[PDB]
Design a protein around this ligand. Structure first.
Ligand SMILES: CC(=O)N[C@H]1[C@@H](O[C@H]2[C@@H](O)[C@@H](CO)O[C@@H](O)[C@@H]2O[C@@H]2O[C@@H](C)[C@@H](O)[C@@H](O)[C@@H]2O)O[C@H](CO)[C@H](O)[C@@H]1O
Ligand SMILES: CC(=O)N[C@H]1[C@@H](O[C@H]2[C@@H](O)[C@@H](CO)O[C@@H](O)[C@@H]2O[C@@H]2O[C@@H](C)[C@@H](O)[C@@H](O)[C@@H]2O)O[C@H](CO)[C@H](O)[C@@H]1O
Lengths: 309, 311
């Protein structure tokens, strides 16, 4: 028959957040009609099509490579983006932004590094990229960093940003940023994002999205550190390898505790890449650390889940 | 002879894959003699049938990281970190592995950032920090490691602290490229205590044959450091082998590196059961590959198999 569908046998803690390069920590559910769930990283159909700005590398998420140019009279640099392999980035490719581009509005702190080609000399400096900034225009091929130097980086040299965590301004409302559910303007002010992966939503009574949650490192302030993704990076990687044809609307998963051998809850993995559970309210799931997801069968949308604990 | 689930390697091009000794992408394939040095990395070690070895674990982002609580050292800019595990539980020094899974497997100074959150009010701080793995204070297998930084009063005690690696450093007024030293193991328990539970040293033992290395270029943050980093298995292969666990029918898996456009086979190589790759070649060589090529398992062969010379 057709190639059988599967999800990785991996506990939540062995897996990686698909929207920022750190491990998953937990499963969280809550109502989502008050915000727009349209992330562009961590988007993949169950049969293996990548969507949005999603790519395979768990470490190249929220990274940037290119050449930098000082902005006279400031401590900021403009980076002209190059591709993941140092090729030119093409703005006309039909994606929202370079694959891996961050998909939330926030200030991401990380380190800008550079080797000088003629001698192998090296430099590294603290740098922030502000994704809601008017100069965040990855889709046009350009992004801007604020740093703690003014003369160190050289023009025409390979430069790389490594993300570390996020930042918020402490004299304003605690946890007011980042805003994990607002996409940046990939092309700047007054321009529409294009080729986005579809916003998603529960579409059955009783049901809520299930999120795979990490905590972002915080570098300064009182940032909102929560980061929910719709698929672990390892699942994206798996669906891409397997390419199993979806046989109905939903793949029914069981989350099992191997110590008791008992199913703890079931959920729906929709064909176009996210999960729902039967629950009303915000809930941090309590799970055994060695619990894992296993595919059960392909069922219709109208399948009724047993209430999640 | 044996009716079991067929062994395979991920269908991924070199550039789609991740280095298994530092969290960055693979760049290229490289081969060369290695009798002058000891090849014994402890990350990116895994058997073809799924047995993680050394200090190797599954996460591509958790290599070279560290978690724990920190403690200031009076009159310096250094902190001592007590390590916890990947889940914030206590490091168990008696677990039978050489050091906490993911610990750096080479001698060098890795620069990165130490971050912290205060549990009770959500406040956060982050500072530039370097860990020197050759230092007498590098004792991860004893639960402890040390960081140099640019602050003496910011980090709190008793609070969750995290180190994200970024790159490596070297002192410019000394011999260029003299560090890091990617083939020297740290002393995991410090001086005057031996390394234990190591994944074994590897060597091509077949006439005409060399190791095939998966190579990246670590970011340099200062000076003239040696930025090459070679690993024996891409992280995605370690991940695949652990998941699949396909039984080995011999000690050697024959792989062909294929160009899927044309169907043509570029070269063939041995993927040994214990976990590294060899090719038939003499001399240092940067492989030239079509950017969409990928590896394909073709069959199990015996001890006596001679590989077609690699370009
Ligand atoms: C980004 C930066 O310059 N950080 C240094 C600075 O940290 C404080 C300032 O950034 C300040 C701006 O006027 O905002 C403060 O909130 C911030 O403090 C940081 O966040 C608070 C809640 C605490 O968690 C602090 O530990 C943390 O630094 O100045 C401090 C002086 O202690 C450091 O130099 C930072 O490197
Ligand atoms: C790690 C660190 O503190 N780096 C800063 C420091 O870098 C210079 C010093 O480390 C100096 C020792 O007295 O050695 C210099 O070589 C080094 O410069 C670094 O390497 C040279 C070859 C160039 O590539 C530089 O771009 C690079 O920084 O001091 C410099 C001075 O500008 C910077 O602050 C570094 O952040």
């Amino acid at each position: 028959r057709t190639k059988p569908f599967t999800v990785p046998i991996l506990t939540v803690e062995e897996m990686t957040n698909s929207r920022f390069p750190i491990p998953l920590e937990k499963l969280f559910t809550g109502p989502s009609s008050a915000f727009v769930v349209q992330p562009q990283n961590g988007r993949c159909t169950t049969d293996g099509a990548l969507l949005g700005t999603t790519q395979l590398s768990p470490v190249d998420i929220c990274t940037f490579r290119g050449d930098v140019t000082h902005i006279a009279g400031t401590q900021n640099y403009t980076m002209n983006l190059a591709s993941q392999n140092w090729n030119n980035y093409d703005p006309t490719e039909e994606i929202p932004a370079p694959l891996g581009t961050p998909d939330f509005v926030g200030k991401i702190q990380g380190v800008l590094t550079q080797t000088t080609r003629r001698d192998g000399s090296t430099r590294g400096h603290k740098a922030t990229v502000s994704t809601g900034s008017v100069h965040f225009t990855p889709k046009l091929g350009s992004v801007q960093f604020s740093t703690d130097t003014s003369n160190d980086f050289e023009t025409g040299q390979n430069t790389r940003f490594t993300p570390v965590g996020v930042v918020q301004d402490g004299s304003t409302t605690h946890q007011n940023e980042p805003q994990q559910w607002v996409l940046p303007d990939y092309s700047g002010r007054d321009s529409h994002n294009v080729h986005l992966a579809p916003a998603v939503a529960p579409t059955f009574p009783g049901e809520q999205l299930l999120f795979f949650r990490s905590t972002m490192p915080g570098c300064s302030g009182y940032p909102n550190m929560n980061l929910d993704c719709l698929l672990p990076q390892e699942w994206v990687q798996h669906f891409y390898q397997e390419s199993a044809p979806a046989q109905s609307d939903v793949a029914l998963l069981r989350f099992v505790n191997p110590d008791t051998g008992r199913v703890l809850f079931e959920c729906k993995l929709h064909k176009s890449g996210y999960v729902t559970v039967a629950h009303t309210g915000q809930h941090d799931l309590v799970i055994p650390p060695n619990g894992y997801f296993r595919f059960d069968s392909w069922v219709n949308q109208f399948y009724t889940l047993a209430p999640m604990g």
